[PDB]
Design a protein around this ligand. Structure first.
Ligand SMILES: *[C@@H]1O[C@H](CO)[C@@H](O[C@@H]2O[C@H](CO)[C@@H](O)[C@H](O)[C@H]2NC(C)=O)[C@H](O)[C@H]1NC(C)=O
Ligand SMILES: *[C@@H]1O[C@H](CO)[C@@H](O[C@@H]2O[C@H](CO)[C@@H](O)[C@H](O)[C@H]2NC(C)=O)[C@H](O)[C@H]1NC(C)=O
Ligand SMILES: *[C@@H]1O[C@H](CO)[C@@H](O)[C@H](O)[C@H]1NC(C)=O
Ligand SMILES: *[C@@H]1O[C@H](CO)[C@@H](O)[C@H](O)[C@H]1NC(C)=O
Ligand SMILES: *[C@@H]1O[C@H](CO)[C@@H](O)[C@H](O)[C@H]1NC(C)=O
Ligand SMILES: *[C@@H]1O[C@H](CO)[C@@H](O)[C@H](O)[C@H]1NC(C)=O
Ligand SMILES: *[C@@H]1O[C@H](CO)[C@@H](O)[C@H](O)[C@H]1NC(C)=O
Ligand SMILES: *[C@@H]1O[C@H](CO)[C@@H](O)[C@H](O)[C@H]1NC(C)=O
Ligand SMILES: *[C@@H]1O[C@H](CO)[C@@H](O)[C@H](O)[C@H]1NC(C)=O
Ligand SMILES: *[C@@H]1O[C@H](CO)[C@@H](O)[C@H](O)[C@H]1NC(C)=O
Ligand SMILES: *[C@@H]1O[C@H](CO)[C@@H](O)[C@H](O)[C@H]1NC(C)=O
Ligand SMILES: *[C@@H]1O[C@H](CO)[C@@H](O)[C@H](O)[C@H]1NC(C)=O
Lengths: 356, 276, 48
């Protein structure tokens, strides 16, 4: 109170100096159940994949996509791209996901990248300069490689440039300049080529299953996992309910919310009750105890004794005397009645030890 | 394949007076025993709404062109659930994505998808005479689709499909809005005991669904069902039904919420000086 | 190509006017225990 009054001498009276408030602890976030999982399981690990020039297109929307499980599996050899990071991606939501899956060779992994040129990057599949998303490649020796020779995979090798994200199912014969009239012979070779993967082939020629995931933005449909936490009551808590952030203590609520209503607002447009999505439970939010602090002194010229009054605070959780004006500490309550000297309030006064 | 239906007499469109209907919850906020003023797209009180009939008595098969300005309030007065579905779009000729909602005999289908929509799409229920069983038999809406983005099919169920005789006993109210790329469909059901009118009183239209579609909608149409037991475009019966279509405008409404939390009554801020 | 200039690429905040001369490996998730491989990459990159 000396600092508050900007003086070293304090006259007898009551002064409001500070404001006691309960700090919030155990911040909690609650989100609805993660029960919308579109089948990501077999889009990456299926029975068989198509050729690189006949890559399949997979459309993903309205899903709850979690990429932490893909990253921490550690069973996938290739994981590297720019624009996005392995962490913090779960907190980013995108409108749509495009998936392109195929099988390439060991040396083909280097060619498939934005800004990189090559025969595959020019005749089979190319990426835009502003590409969003990236590619994941994993070894498939135990599945794609077959003893005796596998020729089910075919890639374009002769072509006259390709637009980004372009599919060319047609494999019309290529002319190098006397026209062959669509007949195999001179100046007209086979435009495609097989792979012929063998078990004896090393890391440079072993098969690799490749999936490219791209995100486009311009309403968002597929978001992150949105993990939740535990629920605790009877404490001043920072709560995050469905993105709504607030501070307060939860308690049992007798209000009956309608099925389509999540949170409730009373008069003056402030949150009063909220229904958590996990267990359809309605809880009343009330602010945790706070209030001003009043310093009662008989004057520095008289004595240095001090009484502390917490205004409208049930200070059972922090010479304690509780009245409807709050709670006073440091003064002995007496059953007598004298003329008021320091007006505390609500019919309660203090005077000089300090008595109330 | 679809064939245009003939034998439909031309009669001027009918307009009917809507009395304190078309009121819905502005948001998902619970309020108890309080007066709240909110500005939103609403249907004005005591307005004029376009009324379409369906009765054998012609046969009064009403599937005309209807624009979609800012939102649609659709009331269906029925005794046998003749109305089937709704279509939303801009071009309606496979060059732009569209939206389709159909409640057939077993499921409910919502497709955000491109269709080669016919000029006269409809449903058809065949009423067998050898045995008593009303079942859907014909569905002439779309031809084919190459691209398609959103599909939703509800759990299978059973429906009556029989045409009862008497006065109307069911009223299905819907509100369709499209704002910020979100399509909101609000629905309510109400029993009635009238022959032809729009019921008075107050009814709060609770929310039903919120699709994150984000497509432009400036044109919508309805889909009914016809009974069968003539030619392909002459031997059909519409069945007794009616539906009212109204347009929503940005208005400020004052709503009273009771202790139950539901909407009790509402007044406008631009209808008459007393309400303002 | 000149590869004598380096910049930090991966790191865990940094106060204003703070110097970080240490280039210890960064773990983004089974820890590699300071060994180059999966779940960890070198934090320095060259402009070239
Ligand atoms: C129903 O009538 C409409 C218009 O009267 C028919 O639409 C015509 O379709 C043909 C071929 O599909 C086009 O060449 C015409 O230009 C269309 N008419 C107009 C005005 O655009 C429609 O084919 C009819 N449905 C039938 C016969 O099943
Ligand atoms: C009502 O519509 C639904 C949705 O199309 C129909 O359910 C599909 O029926 C076809 C044909 O039997 C099946 O191939 C699909 O697998 C069904 N989809 C499901 C079950 O999600 C249903 O058959 C229609 N009902 C009637 C009476 O036509
Ligand atoms: C295949 O990929 C899916 C991705 O959803 C993953 O869950 C699964 O564990 C993988 N299986 C193998 C054998 O790698
Ligand atoms: C959410 O999941 C929990 C755990 O299974 C379950 O107890 C609860 O009923 C679920 N709530 C909803 C709304 O699905
Ligand atoms: C209070 O002030 C008076 C004069 O202002 C002085 O004589 C007296 O000593 C002071 N009290 C104390 C305890 O110092
Ligand atoms: C709040 O104050 C009242 C005084 O009437 C007291 O009985 C009660 O125990 C206090 N609350 C708590 C949690 O201590
Ligand atoms: C309480 O007040 C009564 C009546 O004034 C008095 O007789 C009693 O001694 C008082 N007790 C205490 C502990 O002050
Ligand atoms: C009917 O609707 C029209 C608009 O189409 C409106 O001008 C008119 O006031 C309404 N009422 C009557 C009685 O015509
Ligand atoms: C009985 O009614 C069903 C309609 O649900 C119809 O398909 C069937 O043909 C009828 N039985 C005979 C013998 O016609
Ligand atoms: C389908 O989407 C592709 C992708 O852009 C587009 O080129 C095509 O015009 C769309 N419509 C049809 C009928 O393929
Ligand atoms: C809707 O119309 C606006 C007009 O500015 C256009 O920018 C937008 O691409 C359209 N959206 C669709 C899905 O057609
Ligand atoms: C809620 O509605 C019921 C009737 O369903 C009524 O009895 C009750 O008084 C209303 N108000 C409440 C429960 O606060």
């Amino acid at each position: 109170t000396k600092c508050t009054l900007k003086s070293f001498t304090v006259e007898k009276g009551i002064y409001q100096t500070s404001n006691f408030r309960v700090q919030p602890t155990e911040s909690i976030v609650r989100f609805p159940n993660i029960t919308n999982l579109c089948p990501f399981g077999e889009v990456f690990n299926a029975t068989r994949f198509a050729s690189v020039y006949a890559w399949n297109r997979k459309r993903i929307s309205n899903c709850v996509a979690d990429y932490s499980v893909l990253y921490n599996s550690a069973s996938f050899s290739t994981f590297k791209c720019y624009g996005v990071s392995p962490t913090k991606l779960n907190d980013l939501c995108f409108t749509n996901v495009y998936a392109d899956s195929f099988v390439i060779r060991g040396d083909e992994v280097r060619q498939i990248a934005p800004g990189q040129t090559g025969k595959i990057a020019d005749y089979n599949y190319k990426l835009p300069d502003d590409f969003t998303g990236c590619v994941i490649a994993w070894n498939s020796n135990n599945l794609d490689s077959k003893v005796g020779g596998n020729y089910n995979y075919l890639y374009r090798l002769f072509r006259k440039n390709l637009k980004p994200f372009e599919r060319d199912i047609s494999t019309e014969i290529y002319q190098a300049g006397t026209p062959c009239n669509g007949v195999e012979g001179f100046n007209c070779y086979f435009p495609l080529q097989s792979y012929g993967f063998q078990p004896t082939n090393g890391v440079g020629y072993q098969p690799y299953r490749v999936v490219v995931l791209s995100f486009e933005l311009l309403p968002a449909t597929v978001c992150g996992p949105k993990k939740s936490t535990n629920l605790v009551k009877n404490k001043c808590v920072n709560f995050n309910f469905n993105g709504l952030t607030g501070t307060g203590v939860l308690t049992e609520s007798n209000k009956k919310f309608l099925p389509f209503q999540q949170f409730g607002r009373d008069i003056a447009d402030t949150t009063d009750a909220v229904r958590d999505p996990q267990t359809l439970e309605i809880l009343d939010i009330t602010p945790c105890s706070f209030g001003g602090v009043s310093v009662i002194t008989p004057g520095t010229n008289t004595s240095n004794q001090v009484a502390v009054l917490y205004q409208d605070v049930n200070c059972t959780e922090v010479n304690v005397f509780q009245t409807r004006a709050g709670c006073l500490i440091g003064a002995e309550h007496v059953n007598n009645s004298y003329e008021c000297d320091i007006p505390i309030g609500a019919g309660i006064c203090a005077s000089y030890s300090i008595i109330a | 394949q679809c064939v245009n239906l003939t034998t439909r007499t031309q009669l001027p469109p009918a307009y009917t007076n809507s009395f304190t209907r078309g009121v819905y919850y502005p948001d998902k906020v619970f309020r108890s025993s309080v007066l709240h003023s909110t500005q939103d797209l609403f249907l004005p009180f005591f307005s004029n709404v376009t009324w379409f009939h369906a009765i054998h008595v012609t046969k009064r098969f009403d599937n005309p062109v209807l624009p979609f300005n800012d939102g649609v309030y659709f009331a269906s007065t029925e005794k046998s659930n003749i109305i089937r579905g709704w279509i939303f779009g801009t071009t309606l000729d496979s060059k732009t994505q569209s939206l389709l909602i159909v409640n057939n005999a077993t499921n409910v289908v919502i497709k955000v998808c491109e269709f080669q929509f016919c000029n006269d799409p409809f449903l058809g229920v065949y009423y067998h005479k050898n045995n008593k069983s009303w079942m859907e038999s014909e569905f002439r809406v779309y031809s084919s689709a190459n691209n398609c983005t959103f599909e939703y099919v509800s759990q299978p169920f059973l429906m009556d499909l029989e045409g009862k005789q008497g006065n109307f006993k069911n009223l299905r109210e819907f509100v369709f809005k499209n704002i910020d790329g979100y399509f909101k469909i609000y629905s309510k059901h109400t029993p009635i005991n009238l022959v032809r009118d729009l019921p008075q009183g107050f009814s709060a239209l609770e929310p039903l669904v919120d699709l994150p579609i984000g497509i432009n909608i400036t044109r919508f149409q309805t889909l009914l069902a016809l009974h069968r037991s003539g030619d392909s475009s002459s031997g059909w019966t519409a069945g007794a039904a009616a539906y009212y279509v109204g347009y929503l405008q940005p208005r400020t409404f004052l709503l009273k919420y009771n202790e139950n939390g539901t909407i009790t009554d509402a007044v406008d801020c631009a209808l008459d000086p007393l309400s303002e």
